[PDB]
Design a protein around this ligand. Structure first.
Ligand SMILES: [Mn+2]
Ligand SMILES: [Mn+2]
Lengths: 293, 11, 581, 64
């Protein structure tokens, strides 16, 4: 039963390692199982170090394969990918399938956050829906993956010090208790604390300000400092803004912007970075440029 | 960054 | 009879496109249910006359009509469905026109020759004469398919139709005509092509639009391949020769890409006569695009040359231009060259390569650019079999250590893959003198691909240099690497033990490797905790039942006791694999 | 295999074959939903005036 299913899942893992998407029935059975495996994790799904934090992916399968080459194979090096891994990529379906497959195979060797782009509305008008219709013909898999995207956690806490979340802080939210009390079984609303968490970002301003993205806000140095004092956090890690060094510090070593999708849209040519924390919370950094194709 | 980077690739 | 149409109209006129697509998909079922006469009489005029503001339905019905012939009643009645296809041809979207033309190709292929001549040929003249360039472009493709089954008079008529439409003023249709020209010559005869096509072809080449001249060169290579050698020199060599020196670099880029086909078709004598000077001219063009494109074809151009004067021309013209190309400062051209320059290592031979190539290859390797280095070091293997190990090993020895540690990791991987050959060539002493340090440094490289490749290479080294040598030098250090606070290096040690225990016999593994691996089972880190079980699984077959049942079994059963589900599962898996309980 | 209501509207024994299929795709309840939706679709006159669907022969066939 469980044993034979585990071996069957192994075949799916190795196949996805070969860029070969699963059958529609297999996708259905995967999503069904993943619902029961994600239902048990609260908003701040605490994860113990060591860890390897990975920034934005945007479903670039070659890049993800090189990222595995760099950091290590999933069963060995624990990972904490942060969102936006379904859009603006010609292999988004394969990427998301691989991520969810790894999550279901290993409950705690990996953990995936929910980015702004994992919702019903955004995917329809940013490719993923089109990709699914082209590949599988119909939209059954689409209505499976979009349904799954709601059950993802919202933020991760590493040894009570590092706070990893895709977007950033929000004027409504102030404490981890509020995040824990937030309800996630809801397509990201267009305005609200949940909305902003997936569209926030840093800036050298101070105070607050309407984000040019049209959703969420933009926080300042003092806001991040005050929030860190409020809850004893020592560093927040987000990945929503494309960068060049791959990892950039802001707010005087308070928020780290990570981005692990090199050469965004195949044309930016930006490098990509990955952060890794050893057992003694000894951060490091690795950089890379996409593998030859 | 692109302006810094050279790219003479043309069809 | 009309109820199906009544349901179709309401189904097709709605808000979404999915229902319209489903209606198109079910069109075949509707038609077969209604009957051949019903569809031919009523359904076909309706789809001919209906106009849609949206295109996916148009594309779906275009592809559907091709298969719809058997429902229509076979080739005898395809004349009934030609009108809808031609009416669909004139559209504002290129993809739907492409589907229309391929459907027309299928229809013509299935069409009987007599009915084809009777109806289809009259249709193509209308389609070409349609004032709309869309109609003309859709027409131009049908000439190749329709040529065979028609009579000689029709062949002449369509040949002059093709010439007339090719003589059109606007490039928008001339490009499509030129593209179809290559296919068209496939079905024509030698006399007809040399009489009509080659003159219009030279006219197209003389045309001003580099866009049309890009397809003209493609048609040039196609017709050159079609024709025998003894006639191409009469007409086409002047055309391609003058095209190769056109002001616009786009045509010079395209012919650089297609250069190999041209030389292959003409034959080595023609290449020796006149192509090689033109190829050299490309080597020294200010445009980097043409330079890189031509450089990409140097290996394949050279290998297609007879040995009579291959090496002679290579020394005399090729290599002098190659060295200048290397000297060029542009990044992309140099990177493209670096991949191909190693191509002609066996062609020149042992003496010639060491005489000329190696100085240039070393310079390429000792370059600031990362792209050139990663490209060149990738193809290091090719020179290995043409040039004995020792020569190139000594040549590269000065730069190995600096190259052994550099920015990119791909080149580091390339080196670590090739080092054991150097170790075998240079013996134990020199390797222990300096290379051992490089290997050990690689054993803790940041990246993971390095670590793994280095451990694999260390597998080769131990068997090359003897078990006692490893027990003397490598074991005390790698095994000592299992204590640092970081867990990454403590995983590296486990991988190294998994690998070495294969070659290092059994006594040494039991008295050196085992004790440490077993003592590591209590490490607080879950990752290493289950990867230890993974290592025990692999290493169990190499022990003796006594040692296993004595010490391994307690550790493995202890692993099952702990709380982490994943390590518990690996413990059970290894226990059942080794059948210890 | 997917078969919408048009097949059963044109041919009657198709419904019998579908219900005989051990795994009728779509399910019979879905077939009911689709048929009754088609029957209940309002009628839009040429003047963009909405009216209750006329009970035509097609509507009666859907209902039965
Ligand atoms: Mn993103
Ligand atoms: Mn985002």
């Amino acid at each position: 039963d469980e044993k034979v299913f585990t071996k069957e899942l192994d075949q799916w893992i190795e196949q996805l390692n070969e860029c070969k998407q699963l059958s529609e029935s297999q996708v259905k059975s995967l999503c069904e199982k993943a619902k029961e495996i994600l239902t048990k994790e609260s908003n701040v799904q605490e994860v113990r170090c060591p860890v390897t934090v990975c920034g934005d992916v945007h479903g670039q399968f070659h890049d993800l394969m090189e990222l595995f080459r760099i950091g290590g194979k999933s069963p060995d090096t624990n990972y904490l990918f942060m969102g936006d891994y379904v859009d603006r990529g010609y292999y988004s379906v394969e990427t998301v399938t691989l991520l969810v497959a790894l999550k279901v195979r290993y409950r705690e060797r990996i953990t995936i956050l929910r980015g702004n782009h994992e919702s019903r509305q955004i995917t329809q008008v940013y490719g993923f829906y089109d990709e699914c219709l082209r590949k599988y013909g119909n939209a059954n898999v689409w209505k499976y993956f979009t349904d799954l995207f709601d059950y993802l956690p919202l933020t991760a806490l590493v040894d009570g010090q590092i706070f990893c979340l895709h977007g950033g802080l929000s004027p409504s939210i102030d404490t981890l208790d509020h995040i824990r009390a937030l309800d996630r079984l809801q397509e990201v609303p267009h305005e609200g604390p949940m909305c902003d968490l997936l569209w926030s970002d840093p800036d050298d301003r101070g105070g607050w300000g309407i984000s040019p993205r049209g959703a969420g806000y933009t926080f300042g140095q003092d806001i991040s400092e005050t929030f860190n004092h409020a809850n004893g956090l020592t560093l927040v890690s987000r990945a929503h803004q494309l960068v060049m060094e791959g990892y950039n510090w802001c707010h005087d070593r308070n928020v780290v912007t990570i981005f692990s999708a090199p050469n965004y849209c195949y044309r930016c040519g930006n490098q990509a970075a990955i952060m890794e924390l050893d057992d003694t919370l000894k951060y490091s950094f690795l950089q890379f440029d996409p593998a030859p194709r | 960054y692109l302006k810094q980077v050279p790219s003479p690739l043309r069809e | 009879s009309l109820y199906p149409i009544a349901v179709l109209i309401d189904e097709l006129r709605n808000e979404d496109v999915q229902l319209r697509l489903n209606s198109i998909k079910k069109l075949s079922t509707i038609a077969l249910a209604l009957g051949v006469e019903r569809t031919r009489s009523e359904l076909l005029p309706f789809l001919t006359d209906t106009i849609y503001d949206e295109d996916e339905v148009l594309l779906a019905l275009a592809e559907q009509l091709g298969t719809f012939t058997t429902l229509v009643g076979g080739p005898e009645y395809v004349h009934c469905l030609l009108p809808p296809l031609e009416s669909l041809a004139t559209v504002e979207e290129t993809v739907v026109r492409d589907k229309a033309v391929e459907s027309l190709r299928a229809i013509s292929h299935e069409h009987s020759p007599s009915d084809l001549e009777a109806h289809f040929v009259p249709l193509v003249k209308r389609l070409a004469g349609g004032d709309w360039f869309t109609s003309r472009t859709s027409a131009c493709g049908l000439f190749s398919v329709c040529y065979p089954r028609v009579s000689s008079a029709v062949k002449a008529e369509l040949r002059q139709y093709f010439r007339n439409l090719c003589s059109d003023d606007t490039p928008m249709v001339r490009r499509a005509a030129a593209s179809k020209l290559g296919e068209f010559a496939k079905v024509l005869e030698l006399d007809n092509v040399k009489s009509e096509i080659i003159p219009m072809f030279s006219n197209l080449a003389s045309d001003e639009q580099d866009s049309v001249r890009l397809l003209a060169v493609e048609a040039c290579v196609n017709i050159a391949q079609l024709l025998p050698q003894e006639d191409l020199e009469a007409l086409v060599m002047p055309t391609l020769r003058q095209a190769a020196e056109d002001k616009s670099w786009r045509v010079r880029y395209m012919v650089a890409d297609k250069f190999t086909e041209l030389q292959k078709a003409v034959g080595p004598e023609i290449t020796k006569t006149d192509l090689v000077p033109a190829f050299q001219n490309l080597m020294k063009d200010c445009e980097a695009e043409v330079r890189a494109a031509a450089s990409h074809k140097v290996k394949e151009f050279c290998e297609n040359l007879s040995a009579d004067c291959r090496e002679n021309v290579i020394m005399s013209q090729i290599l002098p231009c190659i060295k200048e190309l290397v000297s060029d400062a542009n990044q992309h051209v140099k990177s493209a060259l670096a991949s191909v320059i190693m191509g002609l290592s066996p062609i020149l031979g042992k003496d010639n390569t060491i005489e000329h190539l190696l100085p240039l290859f070393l310079a390429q390797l000792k370059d600031e650019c990362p792209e050139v280095r990663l490209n060149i070091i990738s193809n290091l293997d090719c020179v290995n079999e043409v040039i004995g190990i020792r020569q190139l090993s000594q040549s590269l020895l000065p730069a190995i250590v600096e190259l052994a540690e550099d920015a990119k990791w791909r080149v580091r991987l390339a080196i670590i893959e090739y080092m054991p050959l150097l170790a075998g060539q240079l013996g134990v002493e020199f390797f222990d003198e300096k290379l051992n340090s490089l290997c050990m440094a690689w054993l803790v490289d940041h990246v993971y691909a390095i670590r793994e490749a280095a451990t694999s290479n260390l597998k080769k080294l131990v068997e090359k240099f003897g078990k006692e040598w490893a027990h003397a030098t490598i074991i005390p250090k790698v095994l000592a690497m299992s204590g640092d606070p970081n867990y990454l290096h403590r995983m590296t040690t486990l991988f190294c033990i998994n690998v070495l225990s294969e070659v290092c016999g059994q006594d040494i593994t039991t008295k050196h490797m085992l004790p440490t691996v077993l003592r590591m089972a209590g490490d607080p880190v879950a990752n290493v905790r289950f990867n230890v079980a993974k290592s025990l699984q692999k290493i169990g077959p190499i022990l003796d039942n006594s040692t296993l049942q004595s010490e391994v079994k307690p550790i493995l059963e202890k692993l099952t006791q702990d709380q982490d589900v994943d390590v518990k599962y690996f413990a059970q898996e290894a226990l059942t694999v080794l059948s210890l309980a | 295999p997917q078969t919408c209501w048009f097949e059963f509207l044109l041919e009657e024994s198709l419904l019998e074959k579908h219900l005989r299929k051990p795994c009728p795709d779509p399910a019979p309840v879905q077939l009911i939903v689709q048929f009754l939706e088609q029957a209940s679709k309002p009628s839009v006159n040429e003047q963009n005036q909405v009216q209750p669907p006329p009970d035509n022969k097609r509507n009666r066939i859907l209902k039965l």
